[PDB]
RNA sequence: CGCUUGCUCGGUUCGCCGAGACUCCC
DNA sequence: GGAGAATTGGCCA
DNA sequence: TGGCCAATTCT
């Protein structure tokens, strides 16, 4: 179908009417697909489908012991295992019933009673394009240590340059024929057609503690009206909250929910676990997935919850149709006790665009001003006092030449700057603990090292200096950064002649400089470099204890909810300026520099906004 | 115009309330 | 690296 | 007949 995408003028569809085309090609006939693809000649299709989480509320024996998992077990920790070369051996893989016989019968494989295509197709794929991925991540990341490596060398080579021997390593590929058994087996369980979600039926389905719902009936609503809940019930806002509302159509929570009973500093309220999860399990809405004998029944309320807030959906909608914008393919993962939904290709209107350079971002935004004359545009200042700056503008259409109209530029809000410092303020004491922990745990001689190296300081290195006879006088201030006083300093007891030099380049054109080496040349001459034996070492043993540790991967799933809610913040005053719909983000090429730079490009890929790198 | 679970940050009279993220996984 | 669904087929009451 | 849980097949 791809081939013969002619007949239509530039326009692409989406990936399942493309695989339902080359249906209708290979099948009889030809003129079917076009008059298939016929009337869905989009420009822009969907090509994202964002995910959707639910808990789970019961099962019948926990998700190790079926047999969907000892089976999907078996061919990881086969697969993941045996030598680089014998993967393209065994790798017959196929997708039939005779093809994955005389492949799990063939080998060590022990299947245990499962035999479902389609399950078996996707263990099979994903656990010999897992091993695929773990390699090339291998060789991705030899890419970029030569990347960075000739980037070094190519800095280094314009001033004194102490000599470079990176530790040579080729692909791991483990130490024998092995390649690595890195990949560890993962216990999801991967749902498939024939076991794709459904309302709970108490009829069909086991007889469980909490009850069902009609599947055609309109889903519950929350509390119609608050306001009405009586004194000495739950749900009651006291008369003095009344007045200071919100008026926001926000997000309403019911009075069992976790984040108002949450051990707080000022609380000073009892939290009960039990009752709270008793009140919570009466208004569930359960679906269960049933495979071979088993079956697990999970909360149909985070589905609901993603619906609404996206704005797919209004109240009012039925358990059959609100399960029929997702794909009947959950993920079903032991370890968070959740299982993760994946929008319909078509539930959000998302194209996932690429950040544009150079000459495309011209011809973007020909193509953006065409259908609409004004698109609204935003440049992104990262590098000054506050987090974000950003400018906006209105580009209109004028034959092959783009306008500009500036419009003002704005600031990140004072209310929002101070929950980024209350952040700074929690992650320096996180990093700087779990340095001092890892202090603990070096090597007695490595921790002495490491005190001694942080210890010795700019006179310790100018020791040598000092062993030449001076004493600091002219760089003592400040060392005049901007410009080169160290041989100065050595002439101030005769030693300039002893001054080393530097030999700069002329860059393009041929030639070279002699010129007094630099105050941090001379710094880098001087000051020391561990060697990376013991650098490594404590480099390694921070980065798995910060890992391990049980505040840092709370503070960094901070960090990105902090960056995404400044990007946001940024797109509606975007909209808000320009009064436009299309807009346009024009970027430039501890901190939160590197987080918010993702979060910026993220949007071309999660929302389709274009973004410009310039 | 539009929101019942879960999660992050805040206030409290302890009743509840105000903002926030939502591309997830090895 | 992963995160479908239509169309077809054997199928017994 | 019509009903139903599984293989086939596609970018």
Redesign the pocket.
């Known amino acids: 179908?791809?081939l013969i995408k002619k007949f239509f003028p530039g326009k692409r569809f989406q990936?399942?009417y493309?695989?339902?085309a080359?249906?209708k090609?290979?099948?009889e006939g030809e003129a079917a697909a076009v008059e298939y693809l016929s009337g869905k000649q989009e420009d822009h299709p969907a090509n994202f489908?964002?995910?959707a989480?639910?808990?789970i509320l019961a099962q019948s024996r926990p998700l190790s012991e079926w047999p969907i998992n000892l089976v999907s077990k078996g061919v990881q920790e086969y697969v993941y295992g045996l030598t680089a070369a014998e993967r393209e051996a065994n790798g017959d893989f196929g997708?039939?019933?005779?093809s994955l016989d005389r492949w799990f019968a063939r080998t060590g494989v022990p299947t245990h009673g499962y035999?479902?295509?389609?399950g078996l197709?996707?263990i099979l794929?994903?656990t010999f394009?897992?091993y695929?991925?773990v390699i090339?991540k291998v060789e991705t990341r030899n890419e970029k240590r030569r990347s960075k490596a000739t980037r070094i060398n190519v800095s280094r080579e314009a001033d004194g340059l102490p000599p470079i021997e990176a530790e040579p390593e080729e692909t791991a590929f483990g130490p024998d024929g092995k390649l690595k058994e890195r990949?560890?087996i993962?216990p999801?369980i991967?749902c498939?057609?024939?076991v794709?979600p459904v309302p709970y039926n108490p009829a069909k389905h086991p007889a469980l503690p909490f009850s069902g719902v009609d599947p055609g009936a309109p889903?519950?609503?929350?509390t119609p009206n608050?306001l009405s809940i009586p004194k000495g019930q739950?749900?009651?806002?006291?008369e003095?909250?009344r007045p200071?509302?919100?008026?926001?159509?926000?997000?309403?929570?019911?009075?069992?929910?976790?984040?108002?009973?949450?051990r707080?500093?000022?609380?000073?309220?009892v939290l009960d676990e039990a009752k709270?999860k008793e009140a919570?399990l009466k208004?569930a809405?359960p679906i269960i997935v049933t495979i071979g004998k088993d079956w697990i029944v999970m909360?149909a309320?985070?589905l609901?919850?993603?619906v609404?807030?996206?704005?797919i959906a209004?109240?009012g909608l039925s358990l059959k149709e609100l399960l029929g914008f997702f794909?009947?393919?959950p993920?079903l993962?032991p370890?968070r006790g959740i299982a993760?939904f994946?929008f319909?290709l078509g539930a959000v209107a998302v194209h996932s665009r690429k950040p544009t350079r150079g000459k495309k971002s011209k011809e973007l935004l020909l193509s953006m001003t065409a259908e609409k004359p004004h698109v609204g545009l935003v440049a992104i200042d990262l590098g000054q006092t506050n987090p974000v700056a950003a400018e906006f503008s209105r580009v209109k259409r004028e034959g092959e030449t783009l306008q500009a109209e500036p419009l003002g530029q704005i600031v990140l809000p004072d209310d929002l700057v101070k929950?980024l410092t209350?952040y700074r303020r929690a992650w320096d004491a996180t990093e700087e603990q779990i340095k001092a922990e890892a202090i603990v745990q070096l090597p007695e001689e490595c921790r002495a090292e490491v005190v001694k190296v942080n210890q010795m300081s700019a006179e310790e290195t100018k020791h040598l200096i000092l062993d030449r006879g001076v004493s600091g006088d002219l760089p003592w201030e400040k060392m005049t950064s901007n410009t080169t006083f160290i041989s100065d300093h050595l002439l101030a007891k005769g030693v300039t002649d002893q001054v080393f030099f530097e030999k700069k380049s002329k860059g393009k054109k041929k030639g070279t400089e002699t010129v007094k080496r630099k105050d941090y040349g001379w710094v880098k001459l001087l000051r020391p470099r561990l060697s990376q034996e013991t650098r490594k070492a404590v480099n390694d043993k921070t980065w798995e204890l910060k890992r391990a540790s049980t505040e840092y991967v709370?503070l960094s799933?901070?960090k990105?909810?902090?960056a995404?809610?400044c990007?946001?913040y940024i797109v509606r005053e975007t909209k808000r300026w320009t009064q436009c719909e299309d807009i346009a983000i024009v970027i430039e090429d501890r901190w939160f520099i590197q987080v918010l730079h993702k979060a910026f490009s993220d949007l071309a890929?999660?929302?389709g906004l274009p973004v410009i790198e310039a």
């Open positions: 179908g791809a990936k399942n493309l695989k339902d080359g249906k090609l290979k099948r489908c964002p995910p989480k639910v808990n997708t039939s019933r005779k035999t479902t295509v389609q197709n996707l794929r994903h394009n897992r695929d991925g090339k990949p560890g993962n999801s991967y498939y057609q024939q794709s889903l519950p609503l929350g608050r739950p749900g009651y806002v006291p003095w909250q200071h509302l919100s008026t926001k159509n926000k997000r309403i929570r019911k009075w069992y929910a976790r984040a108002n009973w949450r707080k500093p000022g609380r000073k309220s709270l919570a208004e809405i909360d309320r985070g609901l919850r993603a609404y807030w996206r704005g209004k109240p794909s009947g393919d993920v993962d370890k993760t994946t319909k929950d209350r709370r799933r901070r990105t909810e902090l995404r809610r990007v946001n890929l999660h929302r």
